[PDB]
Amino acid sequence: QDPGINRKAINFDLSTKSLEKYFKDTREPYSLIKKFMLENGFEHRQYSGYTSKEPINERRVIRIINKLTKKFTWLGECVKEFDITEIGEQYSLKETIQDLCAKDFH
Amino acid sequence: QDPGINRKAINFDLSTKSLEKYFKDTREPYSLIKKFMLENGFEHRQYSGYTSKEPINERRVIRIINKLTKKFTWLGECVKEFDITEIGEQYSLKETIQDLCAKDFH
Amino acid sequence: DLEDLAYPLLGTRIVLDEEKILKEGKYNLEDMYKMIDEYAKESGMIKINKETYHCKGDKYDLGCMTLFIYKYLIDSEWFTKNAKEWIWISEKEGNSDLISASKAEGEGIWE
Amino acid sequence: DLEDLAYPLLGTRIVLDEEKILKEGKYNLEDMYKMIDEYAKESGMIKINKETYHCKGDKYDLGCMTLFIYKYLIDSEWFTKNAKEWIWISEKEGNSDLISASKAEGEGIWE
């Protein structure tokens, strides 16, 4: 499509003390955000963060974040960090690391 | 310096069941990797993962991962995912999100 | 040091419909531009010329663009109803028409 | 679909010191190249020509390069002692001399 447009990563950290003001079970807000993110073209990683399924330009990303903050206004009270990073390329090393620890060559 | 060379993100997920074979306290292996990563030019995020302090080329990154796997050979047994991603640009939205939830304009 | 100094350009080009503004006599054209300048100030934008504003080029670029476009300008009815041209400028990703996009997305009041 | 199809090139250029190999009579030159080809096969590399191997261009590129260069070739003494030129090729980041880098890093046996 348009090679200038990359995938995006969203990573954030919320304060548990501030989240307890609004939720008795602090696991719910993460579940609420998870649902919103999957609805808006992002997927949760098996490590941490939301990676866009497809490339998405910066204008559309910040519209999604605007939409998110209007939906959950307690985000402004609880956010400790919140970063958008441009993803240039993503490489998988799981099998390579398994290969290295095989001690079959020397 | 060399604009073609980006910062790198390292993100991984380990199996707790497999880690319990090698450590009674499964928090230690994460602390061991954290120390190695900070020694080799990466820093831990307040969300998850290791971001290189400076740009680092792919050759040097994979030498660091080789070094890591030779140091902790239990990594091959316990790794569930392990990704290197090229970082294109990183943007901070903490204060912007706080600004949006200010309801001072309309 | 030698690193972290060159972010790609983000900004916006603005052209008011000055003919419509004077012919209608609703607003004062000079105070529209002063209101736009004040918006750019509290969003952290740099004024290049009468039509053009740019980010500073650091890690806060996206947040500054979020405030200027999608907090202040888009919800200013006097602005959106009297804008002849509105462009989102991205060196890396290309430009786009903010008027056509905002009408299709339901952002702002245009008529 | 239309996405995820164009990874930047990673690969390596290899030139053996054929003159040294024959003059010394230690190894058979043809089986050196067959051993290199077998390494490229089990690392997932594509042979372009006698000197040149490339990754396939997908998310496993870095792992294939890790195996070919830093598991198989670098620990092959018959290889490192008889190599006239060894280049790490990266379209995006530029190329580098693997012989000079490996001697400075202590990777492999060169004399």
Residue numbers in the entry:
A (entry chain A), B (entry chain A): -1 to 104
C (entry chain B), D (entry chain B): -3 to 107
What's in the article?
Most TA systems are composed of two components—a toxin that impairs an essential process in the cell and a cognate antitoxin that restrains the toxin activity. The VapW antitoxins are VapD homologs but lack the catalytic residues.
The structure was refined to an R factor of 0.221 and Rfree of 0.249 at 1.95 Å resolution. The asymmetric unit contains two VapD and two VapW molecules. As expected, both VapDCje and VapWCje adopt a modified ferredoxin-like fold (β1α1′α1β2β3α2α2′β4) characteristic of VapD and Cas2 proteins. However, while the α3 helix of VapDCje interacts with the core of another VapD subunit, the α3 of VapWCje interacts with its own core. As a result, VapW does not form homo- and heterodimers the way VapD and Cas2 do. While the two VapD molecules in the asymmetric unit do not form a homodimer, each of them forms homodimers related by a crystallographic twofold axis, resulting in two distinct VapD-VapW complexes with a 2:2 stoichiometry, designated as complexes 1 and 2. In the VapD-VapW complex, the binding of the VapD toxin to the VapW antitoxin mimics the interactions between the dimers in the VapDHin hexamer. The crystal structure of the VapD-VapW complex indicates that VapW neither blocks the catalytic cleft of VapDCje nor disrupts homodimer formation.
